[PDB]
Design a protein around this ligand. Sequence first.
Ligand SMILES: NC(=O)c1ccc[n+]([C@@H]2O[C@H](COP(=O)([O-])OP(=O)(O)OC[C@H]3O[C@@H](n4cnc5c(N)ncnc54)[C@H](OP(=O)(O)O)[C@@H]3O)[C@@H](O)[C@H]2O)c1
Length: 314
Amino acid sequence: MASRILLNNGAKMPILGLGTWKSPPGQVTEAVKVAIDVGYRHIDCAHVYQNENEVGVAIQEKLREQVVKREELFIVSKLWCTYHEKGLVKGACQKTLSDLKLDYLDLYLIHWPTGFKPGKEFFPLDESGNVVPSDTNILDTWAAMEELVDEGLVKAIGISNFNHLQVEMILNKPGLKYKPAVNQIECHPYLTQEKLIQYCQSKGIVVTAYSPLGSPDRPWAKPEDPSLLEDPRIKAIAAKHNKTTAQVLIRFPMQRNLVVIPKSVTPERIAENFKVFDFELSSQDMTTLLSYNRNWRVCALLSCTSHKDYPFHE
Ligand SMILES: NC(=O)c1ccc[n+]([C@@H]2O[C@H](COP(=O)([O-])OP(=O)(O)OC[C@H]3O[C@@H](n4cnc5c(N)ncnc54)[C@H](OP(=O)(O)O)[C@@H]3O)[C@@H](O)[C@H]2O)c1
């Protein structure tokens, strides 16, 4: 297992990163400092998580303390849906850069293929509760992303939550200048994503798996929901290898040539979750984990199911 994967912009991306969705602002600075001390070199961030300033304080202290050089870190953030307009993308990017205390991002993603009306609210609602869309299509948002590369604010651009037809629309864009480097999508044994991963990998797009532990802290968790970390069948594989269930769930995407971004704010789990370079799942174990697919999603963007660009009807 090499620690980095080559992207189609010629850069190398660490295959294990730290997620930050739902990491409280008062705990995420210490989470990111511990993560960099124990070897993480990739941090996954987003404006909509509301904690980039505190992530930035950690990154800046570890660079100032010379624990790591900026060239060895791989920092990812995401353009929120209310900034898909051409004239708002650069300012959105620069606000994230300012918050993270960086002069460039390694990777900037379109967070969802769905544009929303610009304004203060992240989810602008009509008087009945549906998201109010923006008319800007995703090909014009991609052109604005390409401008960030050419202005030196980001080294790579990519997409998140795009379905195969929407990846294909980018790939077929008239005048395309930069292909997406990454598609970040939900992926774990209950949502194995075979077809979309094979499409993206055949096009030289690297896939990042989010919610690899099934996001047990997601706000809308219902107790009858499936639970990966408590699945006896996955616990049995972990027991066979003398590893934790989280370690098997992190190693699983790594052996599919995916990047994976487990979140934790608990120092012991941050360190545990990184100790996955020392064991191998067999091909039989990988096929057995793939057989648990149920097409179950943590993140279904339920308020947007009528948006023209909603990704999950397909
Ligand atoms: N692109 C997108 O639209 C999108 C959507 C969802 C997620 N993501 C990214 O993906 C990251 C990961 O997904 P996620 O946050 O949904 O969930 P996750 O990584 O699947 O699960 C996080 C949960 O697992 C717990 N946990 C972590 N390590 C553990 C361990 N060793 N043992 C037991 N429990 C453990 C964490 O608890 P503690 O923190 O209390 O330790 C937290 O409750 C996000 O943080 C975000 O960066 C992106």
